[PDB]
Subunit: 257 residues, 4 copies
């Protein structure tokens, strides 16, 4: 099929990506201008028409891809499905957050798409650290609700309220002037609860963050190498393994020969 | 003993771990529901019955382990002793924090158990940094108590009070608007005390945290490798040492042969 | 040209750099003294005369460089152009920030100039992470303006106002006591907006910062090596590549010979 | 001299260090107890007598060292001079901070002494980053004093006041609710000043901190190795250099032989 192959090659061109990137930027600029509550009716109609035009250009773009690659081939990519959901949601009249269309900058620009991929692929490796943090938060929230809920109902009156103020305490935001000094006026030993909670959760959150950053950076760096040269660099352990194999080949020809 | 070996293999199965994991989750969910002060008497009785059931299932689980492995073999593991303490404490009627039973998720799930092990084994390596921080805190607290205790008794009136507000100052929480600008109204040179205290303690705490995270991550990564393949990767220094040994063997067969 | 070569060698001397460094420090000290609103008219005239003298010394210094290196040779350096802009701006009477002349300490001291160079050369490598953060900020600001602008106009009444309070929220500054608890009094589910915003942006900002620091440190370390020894250290991958080439040369002389 | 050699070996024993460590701890405990303003006269006299005893034990300890090693040999160590200054300052009656005697725990315990040594030896390597931060702070303080000093004299009325509130702003402490939103009520564009100041200084401070931590950890790790085994591990570049030398020796015996 020469027509399908001319469309797929048009889609894959740098100028097609640049034109779609320009329409995403324009659509996001009119949605940002539409937040201004002082616009005239004519200005609002005008900007809403550019939003309706921007959306239809994405509809033509997506339909072109579903014909050039096929339904099976298009929906086999997570980024094509993501783009399809964003544009198909707009054809649902009864949602209300059109600005999420600017996320398509991530899916459309490959260098930005590799940053997200690296962050997503790094998440499984830190799953046990995230589960440990989740476990500490849950136990702390139950303890805080039972200990301080009757005396401090706005902050600890229920599990949800305790989870919220423990997240604020973990971020160090007014943890002492705002929360723990007011609580110690009633419960003088409360520092025994909150100070170890802060020590354990700030250490665990920083471990979770560093674990993601280190892995994500190395994954994205490997993905960038593959996109440019077709392959990525081999690990230092594999480089030293191939040297050992070459050393054993030389050793074999020294005892025999 | 075929009975003991059938029980130990039942205990070590993935489905036994999955059922115990489900009971820990259920027990934690009813303890969290029991924080709600608006429940009916019947709902409270109902949830308290699920807690009593969850506890007895853990009693059967632990007793099965003490019979399949033996008293010496069971108590030779730090994680078995930890599980035993958590369940045996519940049989002590006169404590009040049943939610600590959710910590058994760490001991029961091996990937979570290796995160904790890595963090614990990393603590000795940062002991001198933690002692240095402790020494700075103690000296600062004595200085702050003597300098500001009479003028600012709520924050520095005693050693305990000074330790608490120096921990708040180290976390940067309202250190200036809340503490040091009010103190400089009376003691204009107080910034000479508090600014170097913040510089030294935030640097030392970050060193302590990074030291733990780096070591803990590498230890847990080695422990994960041993659990899957039976062995961990050798250090790069040991890889280069074995190459030098192979180089000397080739060198020996070049001068002689 | 012996005169041009004697001037260029005078300019390149350590004592010329030390004298210019002293004049930048003196100029910055008089500009700092000139901030004091309690000075006498004579003291102000005196300090303003030292500023006019300091500026003319820089004019002689720059003119000497433009004659010893030539217009093409001088303006071929980004640091010479930067120095020229700083001193030429002062000859524009109608701007108002003479203290920017102290930035010349960075351009004049080579070790400080290499720290900046390392930070600047690290920026392209983190461009996709910075663009991702920018995209999240923009989407969040539009969402916050539409959701909270009518109820909270001081913080979210317009796009600019929302960008500002989201930057404050990302820095964790009074995010809960100051912004999100007041907003949840009207919109109880606002935590669904702000807590994921904080999680995503603090992770992304830390990734952006670490990415810059790691690259900048390695670039500056390579630039320092080149300035002292004429060359920098080769990467470990290139060291292992040259060993493989030497291994293949030994392998060639083992099968043939 | 058998007497001098028996004293030096007594001084260098683990039990002498343990006894001096116990006296430093005891001295610090009585100085902390002496902060309590509710003690009786007899309790104060009692604790002050233990402080006078603790000091004299350090005087005997230091005098023993000056006789066993000699004046030249003792004062040739930075840690011996540091210990001498701390104890000799106490014999100066006219200062007031005896708690600084607890710093001797760092000088007396070798593992703690190596943490400090690693941090001190790391400082020269980050000197250009610290100078860059200092330069940004100075320029910002002059700009802030001239821009906001007349309208906001408590925070920016003078250079010293501006340096203080810029350090608070850099630590993110109430930077917006406390400082920049009150300043933007008068100067609406002030965010153009403060937001880039925060971006640049938090990045630079984190670079300064990471640079210290990374170097200090590696230096202390090398110093610990030398103290235990007499030598430290060689760098990976030097390990690969010795392999290249062995490769050239094998290459020499392949073409000739
Ligand atoms: C690592 C640092 C650890 C600091 C721990 C401080 C413990 C002492 C705190 C304390 O006793 N109070 C808090 C100070 O108000 C007193 C009140 O609970 C009552 O008066
Ligand atoms: C690295 C940054 C270091 C900043 C250090 C600032 C020192 C100056 C602080 C100062 O003198 N005051 C604090 C400002 O109120 C004045 C009051 O103590 C009195 O008026
Ligand atoms: C990772 C931690 C995640 C914590 C998430 C907390 C969610 C619950 C927050 C909540 O429901 N409220 C905030 C507490 O006031 C209640 C108010 O919105 C209304 O009453
Ligand atoms: C990277 C994030 C960068 C955020 C930058 C926000 C710029 C807009 C700030 C602004 O215009 N105002 C501050 C909001 O009050 C308005 C006031 O100065 C006047 O009304
Ligand atoms: C100074 C503070 C508050 C920081 C920096 C130091 C440490 C060790 C950790 C702190 C931290 C938090 O406490 C919370 C969050 C948000 C985490 C959202 C996902 C769970 C990020 C974060 O870096
Ligand atoms: C921005 C802040 C406050 C952070 C991030 C930057 C640095 C350098 C250090 C700061 C910090 C603290 O000051 C205190 C704690 C709790 C330590 C509990 C165990 C001793 C964690 C923490 O990361
Ligand atoms: C405890 C806080 C606030 C810190 C430390 C922990 C994390 C993960 C991130 C936080 C952070 C911010 O949220 C914002 C800025 C300024 C960024 C300006 C350029 C975009 C620096 C910064 O380190
Ligand atoms: C969340 C905050 C405030 C932290 C963590 C994130 C960053 C990037 C930097 C911040 C920071 C400061 O702004 C100031 C200090 C004290 C420095 C004293 C010596 C100059 C330590 C510090 O870690
Ligand atoms: Na903070
Ligand atoms: Na705060
Ligand atoms: Na605050």
């Amino acid at each position: 099929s020469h027509m399908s192959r001319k469309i797929r090659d048009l889609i894959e061109s740098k100028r097609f990506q640049n034109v779609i990137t320009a329409i995403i930027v324009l659509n996001g600029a009119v949605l940002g201008l539409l937040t201004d509550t002082t616009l005239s009716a004519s200005s609002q109609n005008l900007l809403e028409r550019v939003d309706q035009l921007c959306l239809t250009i994405f509809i033509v773009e997506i339909s072109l891809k579903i014909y050039a690659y096929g339904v099976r081939g298009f929906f086999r990519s997570g980024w094509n499905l993501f783009d399809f959901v964003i544009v198909a949601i707009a054809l649902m009249p009864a949602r209300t957050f059109r600005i999420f269309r600017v996320m398509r900058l991530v899916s459309v620009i490959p260098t930005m798409r590799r940053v997200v991929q690296g962050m997503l692929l790094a998440l499984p490796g830190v799953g046990s650290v995230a589960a440990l943090l989740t476990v500490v938060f849950y136990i702390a929230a139950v303890m805080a609700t039972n200990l301080y809920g009757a005396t401090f109902p706005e902050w600890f009156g229920d599990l949800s309220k305790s989870l919220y103020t423990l997240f604020q305490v973990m971020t160090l935001e007014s943890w002492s002037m705002g929360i723990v000094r007011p609580v110690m006026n009633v419960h003088p030993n409360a520092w025994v609860f909150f100070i170890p909670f802060i020590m354990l959760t700030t250490l665990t959150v920083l471990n979770l963050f560093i674990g993601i950053i280190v892995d994500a950076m190395a994954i994205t760096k490997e993905q960038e190498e593959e996109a440019k040269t077709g392959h990525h660099q081999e690990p230092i352990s594999q480089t030293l393994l191939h040297l050992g194999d070459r050393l054993d080949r030389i050793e074999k020809q020294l005892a025999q020969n």
